[PDB]
Design a protein around this motif. Structure first.
Motif, mmCIF file in Angstrom:
data_model
loop_
_atom_site.group_PDB
_atom_site.id
_atom_site.type_symbol
_atom_site.label_atom_id
_atom_site.label_comp_id
_atom_site.label_asym_id
_atom_site.label_seq_id
_atom_site.Cartn_x
_atom_site.Cartn_y
_atom_site.Cartn_z
ATOM 1 N N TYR A 1 32.058 44.654 48.821
ATOM 2 C CA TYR A 1 33.428 44.292 48.481
ATOM 3 C C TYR A 1 33.964 43.253 49.458
ATOM 4 O O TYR A 1 34.694 42.338 49.071
ATOM 5 N N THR A 2 33.593 43.401 50.726
ATOM 6 C CA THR A 2 34.004 42.460 51.763
ATOM 7 C C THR A 2 33.533 41.045 51.441
ATOM 8 O O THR A 2 34.322 40.096 51.456
ATOM 9 N N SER A 3 32.247 40.914 51.135
ATOM 10 C CA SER A 3 31.671 39.617 50.804
ATOM 11 C C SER A 3 32.303 39.047 49.541
ATOM 12 O O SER A 3 32.510 37.844 49.437
ATOM 13 N N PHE A 4 32.602 39.917 48.582
ATOM 14 C CA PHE A 4 33.292 39.505 47.364
ATOM 15 C C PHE A 4 34.646 38.879 47.688
ATOM 16 O O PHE A 4 34.961 37.778 47.226
ATOM 17 N N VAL A 5 35.437 39.580 48.496
ATOM 18 C CA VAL A 5 36.753 39.083 48.889
ATOM 19 C C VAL A 5 36.634 37.755 49.633
ATOM 20 O O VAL A 5 37.413 36.829 49.398
ATOM 21 N N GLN A 6 35.644 37.661 50.517
ATOM 22 C CA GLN A 6 35.388 36.426 51.253
ATOM 23 C C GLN A 6 35.042 35.262 50.324
ATOM 24 O O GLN A 6 35.534 34.149 50.502
ATOM 25 N N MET A 7 34.198 35.528 49.332
ATOM 26 C CA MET A 7 33.787 34.507 48.374
ATOM 27 C C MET A 7 34.952 34.064 47.500
ATOM 28 O O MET A 7 35.019 32.910 47.077
ATOM 29 N N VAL A 8 35.867 34.987 47.227
ATOM 30 C CA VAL A 8 37.064 34.658 46.461
ATOM 31 C C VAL A 8 38.028 33.802 47.285
ATOM 32 O O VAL A 8 38.598 32.829 46.785
ATOM 33 N N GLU A 9 38.191 34.162 48.555
ATOM 34 C CA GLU A 9 39.122 33.471 49.444
ATOM 35 C C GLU A 9 38.604 32.111 49.904
ATOM 36 O O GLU A 9 39.375 31.292 50.405
ATOM 37 N N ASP A 10 37.300 31.889 49.737
ATOM 38 C CA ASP A 10 36.631 30.655 50.154
ATOM 39 C C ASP A 10 37.396 29.410 49.712
ATOM 40 O O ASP A 10 37.832 29.318 48.565
ATOM 41 N N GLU A 11 37.555 28.461 50.633
ATOM 42 C CA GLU A 11 38.269 27.218 50.354
ATOM 43 C C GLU A 11 37.656 26.472 49.172
ATOM 44 O O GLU A 11 38.371 25.881 48.362
ATOM 45 N N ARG A 12 36.331 26.502 49.073
ATOM 46 C CA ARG A 12 35.650 25.963 47.899
ATOM 47 C C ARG A 12 34.805 27.044 47.219
ATOM 48 O O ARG A 12 33.579 26.942 47.128
ATOM 49 N N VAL B 1 30.508 39.780 39.057
ATOM 50 C CA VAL B 1 30.970 38.516 39.612
ATOM 51 C C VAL B 1 30.016 37.378 39.270
ATOM 52 O O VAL B 1 28.869 37.368 39.707
ATOM 53 N N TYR B 2 30.496 36.419 38.487
ATOM 54 C CA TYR B 2 29.686 35.267 38.116
ATOM 55 C C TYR B 2 29.967 34.099 39.049
ATOM 56 O O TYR B 2 31.118 33.840 39.401
ATOM 57 N N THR B 3 28.914 33.394 39.449
ATOM 58 C CA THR B 3 29.077 32.219 40.295
ATOM 59 C C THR B 3 28.757 30.941 39.530
ATOM 60 O O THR B 3 28.260 30.983 38.404
ATOM 61 N N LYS B 4 29.044 29.802 40.151
ATOM 62 C CA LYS B 4 28.854 28.509 39.507
ATOM 63 C C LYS B 4 27.382 28.120 39.401
ATOM 64 O O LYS B 4 26.987 27.416 38.471
ATOM 65 N N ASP B 5 26.572 28.582 40.348
ATOM 66 C CA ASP B 5 25.151 28.241 40.357
ATOM 67 C C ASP B 5 24.336 29.123 39.410
ATOM 68 O O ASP B 5 23.108 29.056 39.387
ATOM 69 N N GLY B 6 25.029 29.948 38.631
ATOM 70 C CA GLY B 6 24.381 30.772 37.626
ATOM 71 C C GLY B 6 23.983 32.155 38.107
ATOM 72 O O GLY B 6 23.272 32.876 37.409
ATOM 73 N N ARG B 7 24.438 32.530 39.298
ATOM 74 C CA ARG B 7 24.156 33.859 39.827
ATOM 75 C C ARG B 7 25.182 34.873 39.331
ATOM 76 O O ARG B 7 26.297 34.512 38.956
ATOM 77 N N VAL B 8 24.794 36.144 39.326
ATOM 78 C CA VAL B 8 25.701 37.220 38.949
ATOM 79 C C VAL B 8 25.486 38.438 39.847
ATOM 80 O O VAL B 8 24.356 38.879 40.052
ATOM 81 N N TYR B 9 26.579 38.964 40.391
ATOM 82 C CA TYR B 9 26.522 40.070 41.338
ATOM 83 C C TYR B 9 27.278 41.297 40.839
ATOM 84 O O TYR B 9 28.174 41.191 40.004
ATOM 85 N N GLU B 10 26.911 42.459 41.368
ATOM 86 C CA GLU B 10 27.604 43.702 41.061
ATOM 87 C C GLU B 10 28.285 44.224 42.321
ATOM 88 O O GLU B 10 27.663 44.319 43.379
ATOM 89 N N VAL B 11 29.565 44.559 42.201
ATOM 90 C CA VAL B 11 30.348 45.066 43.320
ATOM 91 C C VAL B 11 30.906 46.446 42.993
ATOM 92 O O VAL B 11 31.778 46.579 42.137
ATOM 93 N N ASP B 12 30.403 47.472 43.669
ATOM 94 C CA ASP B 12 30.913 48.824 43.480
ATOM 95 C C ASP B 12 32.246 48.961 44.207
ATOM 96 O O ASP B 12 32.284 49.052 45.433
ATOM 97 N N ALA B 13 33.338 48.969 43.448
ATOM 98 C CA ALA B 13 34.671 49.021 44.040
ATOM 99 C C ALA B 13 35.707 49.626 43.096
ATOM 100 O O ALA B 13 36.502 48.899 42.498
ATOM 101 N N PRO B 14 35.705 50.962 42.969
ATOM 102 C CA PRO B 14 36.634 51.692 42.096
ATOM 103 C C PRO B 14 38.094 51.415 42.436
ATOM 104 O O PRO B 14 38.958 51.488 41.561
#
Lengths: 68, 67, 67, 67, 68, 67
Positions: B5-16, B32-45
């Motif tokens: 969840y921490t990394s998710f929040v960081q990636m969201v807050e990222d300037e770019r 969570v979908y990214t621009k480079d075509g990656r997709v992640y799962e974040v366990d965060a109820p």
């Protein structure tokens, strides 16, 4: 291994905080990892949905993740 | 695949931010979908009915939806 | 036997009397005092009272859960 | 503060006063009474006193260890 | 999951005893298995070297084993 | 290879025991040899300096030694 919630908050608020990771289990148990390679368990069903605690942890760069 | 969840929040807050889209599932798993075509799962109820998170994401230009 | 309303009062109270609180999963709180007394409080909602747990910890009172 | 010698006495005693005993790994015993009192006993040897734990259990007194 | 030593002794002495197995760990923790598929943990450093308890368990046909 | 203490005691008490030899190790592991050429390990620290067990085994005609 067992850590009180108060001691956990103490460890988090520590200015030289040794907390590296907090795993938030869906059964209300927190698994807390330290930088020096220790692991603790905190029985705290209330922390599980504690938005300000979570954002405090995140703002500190502590790795927060859910588990089920 | 798995993302904290921490990394998710960081990636969201990222300037770019490379985050393109977030899907908020009922079971508490964020996809969570990214621009480079990656997709992640974040366990965060705790993020499911988080109005603040949703508004943050929307204001960042990130597509958000709940199913 | 101790009412929840008396409990919150004992916590908010100026003079340090409460020393430890145990929140059990069955909805029962065990409240320890500094003069060697222990009370039980029936309050299944006490696990959701974030304000109370927050002030408890803020006063250095030991708070733990049990199951 | 309660001496071990007073403790054994309280346990052996005829009238049911002791309700729960917690044997901590640091050598400290927490002794709960039925009138809502709690004492601490410094006794690292208490973990080896099989006679005492045996009679404790025999009287239906809740005995548990903690660490 | 957590079981007091008193409750453990209760379960053992039960005439319709549901205890099938007791694992005696060297760190003073007992892992207790029941016939109906439950498992409990008992914090009891004193049971670890408790010959009469062990022989009582054995005489009852309860599977007793050490663990390290 | 692995044998419970209960099963060990049962095999020793057996009217026609197949236990030929027992080695009592300092580390609390009993090595149990049978007549059919099998060998088992029994984790049982409580059996190390057990005079009663040793005498029982010897009287059953089972070879016992400690190393």
């Amino acid at each position: 291994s067992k850590l009180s919630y108060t001691s956990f908050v103490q460890m988090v608020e520590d200015e030289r905080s040794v907390v590296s990771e907090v795993v938030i289990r869906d059964d209300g148990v927190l698994r807390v990892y330290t930088k020096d390679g220790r692991v603790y368990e905190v029985d705290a069903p209330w922390a599980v949905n504690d938005s300000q605690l979570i954002e405090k942890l995140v703002s500190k760069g502590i790795k927060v993740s859910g588990e089920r």
